[PDB]
Design a protein around this nucleic acid. Sequence first.
RNA 1: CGCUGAAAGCAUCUAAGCGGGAAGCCCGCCCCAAGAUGAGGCCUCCCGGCAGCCGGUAAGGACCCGGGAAGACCA
RNA 2: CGAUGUCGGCUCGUCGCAUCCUGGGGCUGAAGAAGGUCCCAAGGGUUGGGCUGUUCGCCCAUUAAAGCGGCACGCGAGCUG
Lengths: 140, 204, 173, 37
Amino acid sequence: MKTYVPKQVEPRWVLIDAEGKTLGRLATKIATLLRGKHRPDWTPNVAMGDFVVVVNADKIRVTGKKLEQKIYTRYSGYPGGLKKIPLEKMLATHPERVLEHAVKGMLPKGPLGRRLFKRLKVYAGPDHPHQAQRPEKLEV
Amino acid sequence: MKGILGVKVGMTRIFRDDRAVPVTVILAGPCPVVQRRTPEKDGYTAVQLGFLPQNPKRVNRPLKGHFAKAGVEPVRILREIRDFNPEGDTVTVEIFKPGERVDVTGTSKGRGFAGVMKRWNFAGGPDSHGAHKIHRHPGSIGNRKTPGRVYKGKKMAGHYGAERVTVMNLEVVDVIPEENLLLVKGAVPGPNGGLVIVRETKKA
Amino acid sequence: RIGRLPIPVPKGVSVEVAPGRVKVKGPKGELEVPVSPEMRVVVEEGVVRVERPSDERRHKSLHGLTRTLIANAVKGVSEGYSKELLIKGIGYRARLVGRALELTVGFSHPVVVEPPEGITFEVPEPTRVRVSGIDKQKVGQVAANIRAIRKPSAYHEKGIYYAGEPVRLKPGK
Amino acid sequence: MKVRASVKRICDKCKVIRRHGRVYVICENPKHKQRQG
RNA sequence: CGCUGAAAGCAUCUAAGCGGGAAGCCCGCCCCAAGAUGAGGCCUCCCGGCAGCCGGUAAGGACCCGGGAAGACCA
RNA sequence: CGAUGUCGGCUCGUCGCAUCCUGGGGCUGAAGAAGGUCCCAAGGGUUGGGCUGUUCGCCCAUUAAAGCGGCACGCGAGCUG
Ligand SMILES: [Zn+2]
């Protein structure tokens, strides 16, 4: 009686409202659905988590003074190339990249992890071009 | 933002107000637009300028169709003037006027695998007092075990020039309408005959 | 003794409460006060009040601030406000230029100030200027910038002074 | 603005505030103006 | 450095809020840049037999050759 | 210790800020100018020479200034010795 492995399953699209939800918590549930660890047929070594689309990423909310005290930094490899970016500016420019950074901070690494991050699609604002994919709305 | 294609014909000083104002002479026009970069079509504003004309028997079908969608004769070189919607269909030197400030973008003369002195003006080493075989080397290039590597962007040998270069805030000494020639004070990047782009200066 | 206090609403003043914000339209004009939703607006004709839901520090704070603030607002749309300035310093004075106020207080040039929206610059003389409007904070803001232009001088009465601003300058040479 | 760690009243007019997470010894005397740091 | 302002009748630049404010930061200037594997966008050109597979192909390209302020080679 | 080349100078720099100048400000025993001190500030700059192996320092002349340090008291498979 070997442990069961499922066959390949079509990923079920899932829409998620970025508005009104906390950054960390929402990113948590997003990562959870992304892994497919909501499915009884779950298996680690294969990306069978669901495709996820989010809208109103700008409409995310964050507790405390994290608007400014949270500094998304980057590194160019160049001396003094540490580019600190506060959370506010990062909202004004790339809020979708904010959620990308937060959820990517929670995914398991490795090529499976990167493909999983490909499996996610953020859209700041209320719209997205995936109606053909039938994005199932799912409150969290 | 006004601009025009052009070619560096050479340099020369001339006399205005008892000053031998050195200028570079630049055959700019005429420049026919071939495609206008529109935001609805391309997400921004710009035009596409042909200069100089090209042999019809030396043009591929794709470009030929590109001039059929346009109306211009087949033309050798084609560039974009960002954020420039010329009402006219062939920009010429008339868009500028002598005394107007411009910025010129060209490819400086390719100096090949430039040494480190000529490329970055490193002092090199002494010529005597025992300098062993190092008269033009950069000396040290880093630090010891901490951090024990080479930072990115450390100046070294490589291709000095042969690159898109823009000198800025030049002055239109004089325009030459009949010739499509333009007179700009100072020097322009690139060799004589090397293509260039003349643009209004972004200064103020 | 202050959120305890009742806020009279002498018409013609339309105290319009919205969720977390009031819209008061008096005779002098109109405005809106954004307000903490935690505080209730006791909308009674003639006198409106505020009911702090608890007595935490945040609720006596927000209670007093909300009450006195909205009272300032209704007094704004109902009367507007004024804040004078006694320009001093020899040869220092101003003069209204249409809406913009020119002021020359000893630079390499004059200094012109533009009234934002209601903000009017009254020039009783070149030496004294009034800046009035419905807003209480904004009068102190624009007039604040005015006094910021040529601050008081520590050694001479040579600088933009508030009306009632006590003139305390130290001795010099 | 005397900066220090042990900011304190000097005269009775020395009023103290916790302005923006810091403690300020504000008073009429500009000499008495103190910033804890 | 402020304006409004409660907590705390007063006052308080702060607690709500708003403003000003530096060779500083971001942008703005210049250059690189879609291996940006998120591989972007726009224009123009091409059209059979045994997800494929073969075929010569179209567009086009390469080799070759004359070179070149392009260049170590390559490009 | 079956090797981690040791001072100094040269080249090349990169970084910290406990900032010398340049930017902003507070107080003053700040009349103005020049100042003193402290706060914010690391973008850029921070000279040439005489002496000495020297670093250091003194001195000459300047400068807005002529910063202190870290980087194996940086840097010898880069030079010197
Ligand atoms: Zn005191």
